[PDB]
Amino acid sequence: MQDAITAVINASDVQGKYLDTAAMEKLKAYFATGELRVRAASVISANAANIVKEAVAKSLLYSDITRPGGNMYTTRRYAACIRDLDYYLRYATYAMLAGDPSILDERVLNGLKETYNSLGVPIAATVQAIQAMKEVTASLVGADAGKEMGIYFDYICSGLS
Amino acid sequence: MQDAITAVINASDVQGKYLDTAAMEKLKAYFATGELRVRAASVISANAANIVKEAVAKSLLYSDITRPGGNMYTTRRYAACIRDLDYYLRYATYAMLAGDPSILDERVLNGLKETYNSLGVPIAATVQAIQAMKEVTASLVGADAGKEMGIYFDYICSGLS
Amino acid sequence: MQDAITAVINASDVQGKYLDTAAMEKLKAYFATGELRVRAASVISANAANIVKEAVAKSLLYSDITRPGGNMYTTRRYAACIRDLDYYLRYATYAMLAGDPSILDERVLNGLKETYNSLGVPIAATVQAIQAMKEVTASLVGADAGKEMGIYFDYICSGLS
Amino acid sequence: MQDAITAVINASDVQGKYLDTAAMEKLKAYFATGELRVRAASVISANAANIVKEAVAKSLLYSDITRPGGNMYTTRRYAACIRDLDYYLRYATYAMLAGDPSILDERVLNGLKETYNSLGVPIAATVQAIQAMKEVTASLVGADAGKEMGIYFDYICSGLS
Amino acid sequence: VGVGTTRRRPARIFRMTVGAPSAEVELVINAIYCQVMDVFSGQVPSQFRRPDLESRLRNGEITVREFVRTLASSEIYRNRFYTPYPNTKVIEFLFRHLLGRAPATQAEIRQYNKILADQGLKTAVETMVNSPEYSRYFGEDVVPYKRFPTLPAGNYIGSVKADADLVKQSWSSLSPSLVGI
Amino acid sequence: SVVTKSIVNADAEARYLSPGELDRIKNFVSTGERRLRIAQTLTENRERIVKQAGDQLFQKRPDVVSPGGNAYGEEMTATCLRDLDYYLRLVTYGIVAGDVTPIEEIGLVGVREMYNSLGTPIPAVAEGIRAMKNVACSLLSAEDAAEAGSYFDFVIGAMQ
Amino acid sequence: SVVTKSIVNADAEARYLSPGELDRIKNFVSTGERRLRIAQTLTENRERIVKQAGDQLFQKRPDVVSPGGNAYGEEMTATCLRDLDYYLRLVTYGIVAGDVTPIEEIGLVGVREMYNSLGTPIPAVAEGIRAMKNVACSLLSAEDAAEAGSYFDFVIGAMQ
Amino acid sequence: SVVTKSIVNADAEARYLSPGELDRIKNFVSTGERRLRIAQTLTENRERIVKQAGDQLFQKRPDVVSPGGNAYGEEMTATCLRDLDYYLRLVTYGIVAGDVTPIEEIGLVGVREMYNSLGTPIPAVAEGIRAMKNVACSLLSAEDAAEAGSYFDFVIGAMQ
Amino acid sequence: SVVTKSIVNADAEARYLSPGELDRIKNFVSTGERRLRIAQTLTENRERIVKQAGDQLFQKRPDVVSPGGNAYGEEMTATCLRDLDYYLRLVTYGIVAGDVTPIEEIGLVGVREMYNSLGTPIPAVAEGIRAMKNVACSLLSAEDAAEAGSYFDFVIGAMQ
Amino acid sequence: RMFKITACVPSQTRIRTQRELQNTYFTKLVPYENWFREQQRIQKMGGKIVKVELFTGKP
Ligand SMILES: CCC1=C(C)/C(=C/C2=NC(=C\c3[nH]c(/C=C4\NC(=O)[C@H](C)[C@H]4CC)c(C)c3CCC(=O)O)/C(CCC(=O)O)=C2C)NC1=O
Ligand SMILES: CCC1=C(C)/C(=C/C2=NC(=C\c3[nH]c(/C=C4\NC(=O)[C@H](C)[C@H]4CC)c(C)c3CCC(=O)O)/C(CCC(=O)O)=C2C)NC1=O
Ligand SMILES: CCC1=C(C)/C(=C/C2=NC(=C\c3[nH]c(/C=C4\NC(=O)[C@H](C)[C@H]4CC)c(C)c3CCC(=O)O)/C(CCC(=O)O)=C2C)NC1=O
Ligand SMILES: CCC1=C(C)/C(=C/C2=NC(=C\c3[nH]c(/C=C4\NC(=O)[C@H](C)[C@H]4CC)c(C)c3CCC(=O)O)/C(CCC(=O)O)=C2C)NC1=O
Ligand SMILES: CCC1=C(C)/C(=C/C2=NC(=C\c3[nH]c(/C=C4\NC(=O)[C@H](C)[C@H]4CC)c(C)c3CCC(=O)O)/C(CCC(=O)O)=C2C)NC1=O
Ligand SMILES: CCC1=C(C)/C(=C/C2=NC(=C\c3[nH]c(/C=C4\NC(=O)[C@H](C)[C@H]4CC)c(C)c3CCC(=O)O)/C(CCC(=O)O)=C2C)NC1=O
Ligand SMILES: CCC1=C(C)/C(=C/C2=NC(=C\c3[nH]c(/C=C4\NC(=O)[C@H](C)[C@H]4CC)c(C)c3CCC(=O)O)/C(CCC(=O)O)=C2C)NC1=O
Ligand SMILES: CCC1=C(C)/C(=C/C2=NC(=C\c3[nH]c(/C=C4\NC(=O)[C@H](C)[C@H]4CC)c(C)c3CCC(=O)O)/C(CCC(=O)O)=C2C)NC1=O
Ligand SMILES: CCC1=C(C)/C(=C/C2=NC(=C\c3[nH]c(/C=C4\NC(=O)[C@H](C)[C@H]4CC)c(C)c3CCC(=O)O)/C(CCC(=O)O)=C2C)NC1=O
Ligand SMILES: CCC1=C(C)/C(=C/C2=NC(=C\c3[nH]c(/C=C4\NC(=O)[C@H](C)[C@H]4CC)c(C)c3CCC(=O)O)/C(CCC(=O)O)=C2C)NC1=O
């Protein structure tokens, strides 16, 4: 398992060395910014439904995707699409709290591109929907917290593409 | 799975337009064929076991495959060969009634070639047996029914090889 | 799995003919070797833990692998190394007592190299440990038993190579 | 399960009334004793194995139950006797820290009497062992901690009844 | 180019659950054999089937969960899956046959691997039968069915690939020659 | 199709199609012409049918189309009419199919989740389908209304 | 409660709580007085908060109080106030507990099923919860409002 | 081999082969010499015993030999005799092995399904195997024959 | 290699390496890590690629292993798998080199002459290497498989 | 040796649409070793153990 503090600990364990000053400083930075990250994460969870609604409205709705034959034409596909965005956001916020991009790669980005390719989901459309979520999440979270959230959101998009 | 009517409905849904005249006559072709289909299906079920016996007798019985070391030269191996042939026949009869090859693709022909290869069972031997079963089935079902049963069984044989 | 007597039977079955007198003489040789193999196998089971400890001391003890970051330097990793060596010893004892190496190939070998490659465990280090285990096992079992058990262990090492 | 606060909340929910000052006083008592209870529970965790050993000796040291035909006169029987007491001690420690015994009754006491009756194991002998465990735990943890441990052990004795 | 509704729509399957005694109880019995053991056709429960387990289930004394545990523990399951296939693949076979899904992670493999190495196959099948996932996903008194798990990481593609992997190799005596007429 | 549903049941049963199942397939073959005629009538009167249904639904629940409502405004009202039209086309497909199989895969699986996400009122959508059923009964023959009403009724129940 | 969740994890582990888990218990013990004080304020001003939040909810979603809405008429509106009061008291119980688990056990499990069956709009109920949170923010100190807002927000998410 | 079956049980137990199981293997090593002499006698009477038993079986089931039976005609009768000969060879191999599992894998596993496809009568085949056992009792020494009769009986029971 | 081919062309036209050619040389050297990783995977799985793909070849072309064929007998089939082993080795060399000139230099100049002298079917060798490519697709990730696939493509294309 | 145990577990977490009365109240037989894990699992679910009985003759 990987977290920001845990990854510093894991690197130190591989060395076998006692805690270095550089390791202490990096861990201190994680301790320092945890407050802003925590408050924003709570806000994200509270307004999670509104965020995915805003994202599909801004990117994935009123287009050919939701018009016939667009991989969202049916209610089953639409429900799976909003569910997929919801999972993307949930594991992304998990990782944003953790501070480490490794967690999302472990769960969200493990075979995700292959699965989407097999099912015929548009990779680009998913990426643009993720970016639209990034804008909405930045608006709700605020600039300081949203910038941190944006980095891990963008890591998810990079894994997809 | 799919049907003739269901597949036309799927195509119309993809297009996003209510039933056209072309849709009407494609569906009407299935409606007309229904009588032939159901009569043939009853005959196929009645003579299903005899069909398998006739096919293997015509193709693989009294041959080196039946003789020791031929992949059918055991009681268990022989039973398995008859079983797989019955599996193909039953799904093919389903598919003939359905009018579409989606059932055969989804269930009958999924990974079958790779599994057969790794086992070492001869794909060519199976294909010859399937053609023999097609001949026996066409004789039993009738000329018009044999033509349709030929198409479905051809999908199974071609997918296997 | 397969046994020595079963292998002679399998050859006779592939030929189709009844077992020859010379083939029966080969089976009798297997029967004669079985008595010494059985007594040695009982000895091997009794000192199996000591043999594993001796081989681990020969290679793993005071090694960079045990040192931090050496891929054997974890509590889970050390436990897994011990368990893997024990499993190899158990399969090897079964193969030597049976007198046929087919069981070892059937269970231990299939994708063992692939699994080790995926895990990142050092195949060469495991092979050296296997040779050390073979030496200790030969010493405990005896010279005549060491030839058979050593041959089976060499076969496993050859597959790894 | 339940806690001290949760039990007060359950009573208030049945009443339907807003938070009461008397309920606040009870919750305040739980909060005030919680710090001491937490420190004591940590001590109990640290010396849990030693406490189990001492109690097991006190109730069963060269015991007739250990002697053949005494229902604890097997390696499996002795191990099972140790295991049940250890599980009871752990659950009791959690209940004592929580301040509510309902969870202990539901998880442990429910069905335990029926199982013990079917096995034929002596509930009174187990109760004597539980009393010995209570005495040893009170000695190690302290008098104030022993009072809470005594309440949990009394619930265990009632479950034996 | 518009994708029709058949774009991974039909992977699901009919669910078999126990009920009041009727001839349909043997259909449920057939399903238990058909899934816990890999009888490919689904119309041929071969000789090896356990009729005493069927009798207990018909009476109601044995729940479907217990039926699955006995069937998995029996030498029938061992001979068809445990002894021929390597233990590494046996873990995946247990996950596919019992829970209905491919092994989600190497960590799941790790837990079951030490169980197999030391405790034994019967212990491993018992642990999976008693596992919390079986209680809800597969259900209690419900015949386990193939399930494609979306939430676990890469489990849809892994489950699809593993389910696509039909059983290869066999319990082998008098192994076949390469060429036949 | 009805044949598709029977095939699914047969595949689960691991048995050839039952004689009674084949008999229902034969009935579907016989009723193909009548079902196609009913579907043609619905498609022919499509615009007027859903227009009247939209007026009836907005009359029954004026808050769907009022300020603060989900479909407040001309564009969103047109989108609401499109959703109703999607349902109408699905009902025509289902009437041709002779089974609920066509509709269930499109608009009856997860539809509650989708509508909850967008914000549209599920009960009001169900009432709109009911208004369509009344209009269709008016525009179809008596027994044609019975069959079409049955397929419509399954759609309405799914919305619930 | 925090202790209750720790007990659940410990029950599965059959092992004593780790130092971090004990630290969580100690933190709850340390802030028990703070939780009781916040509950004192909320309970004392509970009725006033309920009436103010009702006014806010009716302004934001007048359809609920409009003709044809669920809370049309004095009796229905009083039932709406009672339901909001039940939610607010549940929030107070959860705040005292320190975890959303007590509130979740009391309600919000199957709340969608129950309220939708009753015929009141789930979004409007959620809006009322939001109004209650805003009133609590006005009537409470910021530090206490942070915790109270968190538990309120959990209720809002469950309502969603 | 019996050792192979014991090894399979040990592998399921995840334990090294039991001392009692090893002793059983040693006991069969002792039994193998006498079994080999018996097997040599079986190979010596490979054809003569088959002919005598086949005459007895044909007397038992005249209908099969009669036209319209399974073994109708010289070619079909020869095929029936060849199947009996293959069973006899399998019996000899299984007797030498000591484990009926080798015989079961080679044949009698799914043999009923094969017979259903081929049209062969299981009762007549079973009677022929029993007649072979009686002929073998005359052919071989009683001490060796008692074990051989049990192997033949295992095949007969699988047929029945 | 890319470096040697660039040098050869520059040598022919009597020019020092162009700036773009220097960039390509630099890029190939830097991505050599990925190149070595792909080759390491292939050499790690030399056994199954050859074995599985060769079995697929025999099944696809039964005539090669039939009596009176080039591969009849285990000795000849062993040599056939040896040839497939040689070509996989050349492919790994080519991946490491970054160019197909090592593959061509070793084993595609005159394959028709050699194989026709042996009697081996050249199209059958091509189909066996196609089988190796298909096996390679599973072993290598999609991005990696495209890189190795091109070398396999050159081998089969020259073979035909 | 096995035990006949009947227990009822309320499905509070999942309000299952599919018929769950059989799961809610059930009577089953578990092996003696299996009974330890099964009793702990039923306790973890929170279901009440209505009865514990021993099918085997000897305790
Ligand atoms: C095949 C199944 C299927 C259906 C039916 C479907 C419909 C559908 N309806 C939508 C919107 C909508 N649907 C409604 C619905 C209503 N408002 C009301 O007042 C009424 C009570 C009600 C209908 C009678 C509204 C208002 C919108 C627009 C939402 C907005 O933009 O504010 C949208 C999102 C916008 C878009 O089209 O991109 C879709 C996809 N999609 C599907 O895949
Ligand atoms: C928690 C990490 C995680 C993720 C992200 C994940 C993704 C994921 N998305 C899936 C499907 C899907 N994904 C989509 C996605 C989309 N379709 C569109 O038109 C949009 C552009 C887009 C999202 C807005 C759809 C429509 C399906 C279902 C396809 C179908 O069955 O028809 C599936 C297949 C199983 C299923 O249908 O649920 C997985 C496993 N799985 C995971 O464990
Ligand atoms: C290694 C295990 C094994 C066995 C035993 C085996 C038997 C076997 N018996 C066969 C035929 C047959 N078997 C019988 C058997 C009988 N008819 C009678 O009246 C008697 C009661 C009885 C024997 C005593 C007959 C009549 C046929 C020919 C069927 C036909 O074509 O009409 C055939 C089909 C023809 C062929 O060989 O191609 C096989 C494969 N195959 C195997 O792989
Ligand atoms: C997707 C549907 C589906 C297919 C296609 C399928 C095939 C399939 N065939 C198999 C084996 C087999 N299949 C055959 C069949 C044959 N023997 C012959 O002589 C013929 C050439 C041929 C067909 C007439 C044989 C002999 C085996 C191996 C049996 C054994 O030795 O254990 C196996 C391995 C397990 C087993 O032994 O049964 C599978 C999974 N399973 C499936 O679920
Ligand atoms: C990161 C976690 C981790 C640990 C802890 C670990 C321990 C560890 N302890 C070892 C040996 C040892 N451990 C002890 C331990 C003790 N002897 C005593 O009398 C004391 C009671 C006690 C220590 C306080 C001894 C004596 C050896 C040497 C044994 C020998 O080689 O003969 C070895 C084998 C030699 C080697 O290092 O190669 C390992 C791997 N390995 C790990 O990866
Ligand atoms: C059929 C019998 C059988 C075998 C052989 C087997 C092998 C096997 N070895 C494993 C792991 C492992 N094996 C090792 C072994 C070693 N590390 C070293 O430094 C040494 C060179 C070496 C021992 C000689 C390690 C470290 C792991 C764990 C990998 C990890 O998570 O880091 C795993 C992964 C799951 C686990 O953690 O157990 C398997 C499946 N599994 C089996 O069921
Ligand atoms: C029938 C199967 C069976 C066995 C074997 C068994 C063993 C057993 N050994 C015990 C103690 C003991 N066992 C030992 C053993 C040893 N100390 C040493 O230095 C030696 C290396 C070694 C013996 C060779 C000792 C010293 C005690 C006493 C410890 C104590 O209680 O203070 C006790 C606890 C005291 C008692 O009897 O109540 C039991 C029950 N119980 C059983 O039901
Ligand atoms: C929630 C915690 C929990 C409890 C309490 C529990 C009770 C419990 N105690 C058992 C056995 C047992 N318990 C004992 C206990 C004793 N024998 C004695 O002489 C002493 C007086 C006494 C200990 C103080 C014995 C001997 C058995 C095994 C019965 C046998 O086979 O003989 C068993 C049978 C299964 C097993 O072997 O574990 C259960 C289920 N199970 C649980 O999960
Ligand atoms: C451990 C070995 C074992 C035994 C002994 C056993 C008994 C047993 N016999 C049963 C059924 C039955 N037993 C009979 C027996 C008879 N009917 C008559 O007229 C005769 C007098 C008599 C036979 C001599 C019948 C008819 C049933 C079926 C009842 C039904 O479900 O309809 C059932 C009900 C479940 C079922 O099998 O359908 C059990 C449990 N089960 C076992 O696992
Ligand atoms: C075959 C069809 C079928 C029935 C009938 C059935 C009954 C049934 N009702 C249950 C629960 C329940 N049923 C009620 C019912 C009521 N409370 C009241 O005040 C009313 C008077 C009454 C409804 C009219 C309640 C409150 C529970 C939950 C009890 C709990 O776990 O706390 C449960 C517990 C499991 C669950 O949560 O579903 C079952 C099994 N189960 C079934 O599968």
UniProtKB/Swiss-Prot annotation, chains A, B, C, D:
Record membrane topology: Peripheral membrane protein
Organism annotation: Thermosynechococcus vestitus (strain NIES-2133 / IAM M-273 / BP-1)
UniProt entry keywords in alphabetical sequence: Antenna complex, Bile pigment, Chromophore, Electron transport, Membrane, Methylation, Photosynthesis, Phycobilisome, Thylakoid, Transport
Cystines in this chain: none
Keyword Acyltransferase: no
Pfam families per record: Phycobilisome (PF00502)
Protein name per the record: Allophycocyanin beta chain
Post-translational modification: Contains one covalently linked phycocyanobilin chromophore.
GO biological process: photosynthesis
Cell compartments where the protein resides: Cellular thylakoid membrane
Curated annotation (Swiss-Prot), chains F, G, H, I:
Pfam families on file: Phycobilisome
One GO term (biological process): photosynthesis
Key words of the record: Antenna complex, Bile pigment, Chromophore, Electron transport, Membrane, Methylation, Photosynthesis, Phycobilisome, Thylakoid, Transport
Listed name of the protein: Allophycocyanin alpha chain
Protein residues bound to (2R,3E)-phycocyanobilin: 80
InterPro entries given in the database record: Globin-like_sf (IPR009050), Phycobilisome_asu/bsu (IPR012128), Phycobilisome_asu/bsu_sf (IPR038719)
Organism lineage string: Bacteria, Bacillati, Cyanobacteriota, Cyanophyceae, Acaryochloridales
Family, similarity comment: Belongs to the phycobiliprotein family.
Disulfide bridge positions per record: none
Localization of this protein: Cellular thylakoid membrane
Record-level GO cellular component terms: phycobilisome; plasma membrane-derived thylakoid membrane
Organism: Thermosynechococcus vestitus (strain NIES-2133 / IAM M-273 / BP-1)
Function: Light-harvesting photosynthetic bile pigment-protein from the phycobiliprotein complex. Allophycocyanin has a maximum absorption at approximately 650 nanometers.
Quaternary structure note: Heterodimer of an alpha and a beta chain.
Membrane topology annotation: Peripheral membrane protein
From Swiss-Prot, chain J:
Family recorded in the similarity comment: Belongs to the phycobilisome linker protein family.
PROSITE patterns referenced in this protein's UniProt entry, alphabetically: CPCD_LIKE (PS51441)
InterPro entries assigned: Allophyco_linker, Allophyco_linker_chain, CpcD-like_dom
UniProt key word Membrane: yes
Name of the protein this chain belongs to: Phycobilisome 7.8 kDa linker polypeptide, allophycocyanin-associated, core
Keywords in alphabetical order: Antenna complex, Membrane, Photosynthesis, Phycobilisome, Thylakoid
Function: Rod linker protein, associated with allophycocyanin. Linker polypeptides determine the state of aggregation and the location of the disk-shaped phycobiliprotein units within the phycobilisome and modulate their spectroscopic properties in order to mediate a directed and optimal energy transfer.
Membrane topology: Peripheral membrane protein
An annotated GO cellular component: phycobilisome
GO biological process per UniProt: photosynthesis
Subcellular location: Cellular thylakoid membrane
Record-annotated CpcD-like domain positions: 1-55
